[PDB]
């Protein structure tokens, strides 16, 4: 379940997604186009180009509905939209070539029903797909991660 998430409609194309985390709407900056919900679109997002992300306070009518971000990231399998993804050696890893362009902004879900990260894209070394993701250090510092030769989706 992840209905508290919203894709961006560009020319009627789901070129990306966005998630309301901690009462702030976050979408990839690279994902061109307008968000689905008109009330969310009224938010004048603030960009953070180093993260390829833009953020802004969701309006006062749905900040209660926000997903809870998750600091803890123990090694294991994490829920997604395309089933679930493994997290290994500090990076989310996914079956080779599953998922791709348009999946940016899809949140990754803690089995407890919380969001641990938002995906930007991926890469393949040849054995497995490695994902690029925004993350949070144990301290709580928000970070972006991008494997070698990362491709945004």
């Amino acid at each position: 379940e992840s209905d508290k998430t919203f894709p961006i409609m560009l020319n009627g194309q789901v070129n990306g997604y966005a998630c309301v985390v901690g009462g702030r709407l976050m979408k990839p900056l690279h994902v061109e186009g307008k968000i689905d919900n008109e009330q969310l679109a009224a938010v004048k997002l603030k960009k953070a180009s180093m993260y390829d992300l833009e953020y802004g306070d969701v309006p006062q009518n749905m900040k209660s509905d926000t997903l809870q971000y998750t600091s803890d990231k123990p090694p294991g399998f994490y829920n997604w939209h395309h089933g679930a993804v493994q997290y290994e050696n500090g990076r989310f890893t996914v079956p080779r070539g599953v998922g791709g362009k348009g999946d940016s902004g899809r949140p990754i879900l803690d089995n407890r029903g919380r969001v641990v990260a938002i995906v930007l894209g991926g890469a393949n070394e040849g054995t497995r797909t490695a994902l690029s993701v925004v993350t949070w250090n144990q301290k709580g510092v928000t970070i972006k991660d991008t494997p070698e030769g990362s491709e945004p989706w």
Binding site: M50, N137, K139, V141, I143
Partner: protein, 48 residues
Amino acid sequence: HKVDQEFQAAVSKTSWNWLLALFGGASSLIVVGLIVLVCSSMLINTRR
């Protein structure tokens, strides 16, 4: 007159002092700003 108004000396000490004061403020603001942009860049790499 017995000597030319060489610009390097036509500026009075007080006047030249205020000129260098204003340009010092501007130059320091731009240099410090650049240094702050450099230091801020290091912030994320120090904690990832």
